[PDB]
Design a protein around this nucleic acid. Structure first.
Lengths: 70, 57, 98
RNA sequence: AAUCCGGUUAAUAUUCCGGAACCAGAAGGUGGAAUACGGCAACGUAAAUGAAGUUGGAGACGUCGGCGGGAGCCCUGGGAAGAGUUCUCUUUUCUUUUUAACAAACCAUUACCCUGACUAGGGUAUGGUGUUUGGAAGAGUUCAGCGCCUCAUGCUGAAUCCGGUGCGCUCUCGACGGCCAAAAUCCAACGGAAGUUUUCACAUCUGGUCGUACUCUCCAAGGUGAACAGCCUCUAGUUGAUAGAACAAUGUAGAUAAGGGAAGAAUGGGCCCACUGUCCCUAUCUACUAUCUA
């Protein structure tokens, strides 16, 4: 569990094959937590801006497994 | 007849003692066939069997 | 400040307790600082319509105390079996039947 | 050397499940630097050659007492929920109210260095002890509601909060005062033989054998009582050891008994005084045994 605050790094992390799946959890505070599980660490990025979260979801790599809120 | 293995099981899912259970005296038929933990979990949600709250300190 | 709402629509419909009876019981049993009717300006009890009672208090007003006060009337009316006080929402208390 | 959580059985969990990490070892690959650094200083960084030979630290250390730091239990206030009490009084009474492993930044009771000739001014390290976040609410717990011939056992809402206290109890760490193991294993230094660098980061893999069920020195609530004496309750666990039935003598045992008070309980006290069924003189009661029935 290593939270990441760099959007570009998260996109680069998704670009590399180290990422396995990405889960976007909708919290009560209306902040989208983009949690991506890698081989050695869990990458979680919390974005309060819905448009930024929507842009991040749209820009996510096609190979990544996008998951809704569990 | 012998409810021993069924009440003792119920207390285990009841997380309290074996004497901390209670049922009415006229439903012995439908409890006797409940053998697994899933059967008991169905029964506790029904409320036919139930604990009792603690009485004072 | 804080607003406490007690729903009496079910009681009015079932005629278990009237709105005036609830208001009279509330007025006669409002032990503000241990004194009945001592609500003053800090706490104002204004039941809007004959279906609910609203209390606006500038100080702390315990919902349990209101529920405890409401339980006395139900015990006096012997309607506890057929009517129970429930917490519909934070600061909202309602009466539920069996 | 290195793992925790939640859930799961008729009987299993740090092993199983779901989720999340850590360790060791292994190669090559990528990128980064490489052809080490600044400060008078303690010391610090992403890396930053080291043969033979030499040295050290840890492992690896006696006992007791007090103090500080923290945690938990217990105690207690407020909020929420539920239940109980009530014409009367009681915002009452009782129950519950969670955040691991590890991963990111924050912070000394102590010692060292600089100025100073102890006091005093600037840094230095351990940060067990916390200042948020991920994990992590999606989990769990408690209420309210619904789904329905049905193994439908799900579904919907919420809350799961703000605190405080310690001659308490337990443990832990730390600054003092005294009273007086070894081996396994790991790290570093000196050293200067040799003429791309790995102790930087990221990606990759795998991790054998055996015990593991079950029955019995450790775990140990509160109150009342001065007290670990004694009781009570809570937690939890039993109602099991052949019974029934009646109550004479006998025997055990516990008591009470007029008047006298060693003629055979008193509080015990200072031969004396007091005391008493030891005795005169035994009487009565209760319980058990005895007795019957199976």
């Amino acid at each position: 569990p290593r939270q990441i605050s760099d959007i570009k790094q998260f996109l680069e992390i998704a670009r590399r094959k180290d990422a396995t799946s990405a889960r976007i959890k909708k919290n009560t505070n209306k902040d989208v937590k983009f949690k991506l599980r890698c081989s050695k660490y869990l990458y979680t990025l919390v974005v309060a801006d819905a448009k930024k979260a929507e842009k991040l979801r749209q820009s996510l790599p096609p190979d990544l497994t996008v998951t809704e809120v569990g | 007849a012998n409810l021993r293995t069924q009440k003792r099981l119920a207390a285990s899912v009841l997380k309290c003692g074996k004497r901390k259970v209670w049922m009415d005296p006229n439903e012995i038929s439908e409890i006797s066939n409940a053998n697994s933990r899933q059967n008991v979990r169905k029964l506790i949600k029904d409320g036919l069997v139930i604990r009792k709250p603690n009485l004072m300190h | 400040s804080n607003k406490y709402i007690i729903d009496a629509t079910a009681a009015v419909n079932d005629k278990i307790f009237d709105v005036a009876a609830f208001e009279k019981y509330l007025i006669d049993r409002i032990k503000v600082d241990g004194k009945t009717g001592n609500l003053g300006s800090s706490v104002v009890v204004s039941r809007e319509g004959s279906s609910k009672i609203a209390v606006i208090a500038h100080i702390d007003f315990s919902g349990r105390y209101l529920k405890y006060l409401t339980k006395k009337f139900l015990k006096k009316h012997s309607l506890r079996d057929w009517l129970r006080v429930v917490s519909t929402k934070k600061g909202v208390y309602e009466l539920r039947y069996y």
